[PDB]
Design a protein around this ligand. Structure first.
Ligand SMILES: COC(=O)[C@@H](NC(=O)[C@@H](NC(=O)[C@H](C)N1CCC([C@H](C)NC(=O)[C@H](C)N)=C[C@@H](Cc2ccccc2)C1)C(C)C)C(C)C
Lengths: 99, 99
């Protein structure tokens, strides 16, 4: 769809059996999601952001359905305020920026 | 133009007679630039990102030329890593998300 930006660009995702709303973020390289129950093994990592750095669990090859399109990639689960869908997955569902 | 997302969406802005480069961020509600010499009166404000909170100087009514397009808005200048063009200016240059 075409999404104008007079409101936050949130979209429903289906991840690990659960339904969530995540923000479409072109300024984020990675997908970072708030703490939730995910199947499997993971590696600790520390991602940087504007207020500093947070420690996250890294899950690779996690299937996620962003507004009906399916994608498989790495998801970082941690202390994020909002669920962030970053550029490693937006490229997969074919998303572009236009002006 | 149309921007795909395999690389960061960085564009050239002209602000306060200085040439800068900045991230086109759909996920940010506000625009926040690195520390710079800018004339005027500003107000103390503090914003959040992941990792936490930074104190910034907010300035209203500043002209920014984002890839040639002129826009007048609120710009926050402070200790950010990258310069971020958030939704208050992105709606002015007509930017939309497509997929
Ligand atoms: C560096 O690796 C990454 O890709 C990280 N990327 C970033 O932090 C990048 N920035 C962003 O994604 C943008 C600017 N953004 C940060 C500030 C930001 C805006 C400026 N904050 C606000 O408007 C608050 C509500 N006043 C929102 C972030 C999402 C969010 C929402 C609510 C509370 C906290 C965070 C998203 C830059 C620093 C490379 C991910 C952790 C998101």
């Amino acid at each position: 769809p075409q999404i104008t930006l007079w409101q936050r660009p949130l979209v429903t995702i289906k991840i690990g059996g659960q339904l969530k709303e995540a923000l479409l973020d072109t300024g984020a390289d990675d997908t970072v999601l708030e703490e939730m129950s995910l199947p499997g093994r993971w590696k600790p990592k520390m991602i940087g952001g504007i207020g500093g750095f947070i420690k996250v669990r890294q899950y690779d090859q996690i299937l996620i359905e962003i507004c009906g399109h399916k994608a498989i990639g790495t998801v970082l689960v941690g202390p994020t305020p909002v669920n962030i869908i970053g550029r490693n997955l937006l490229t997969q569902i074919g998303c572009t920026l236009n002006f």
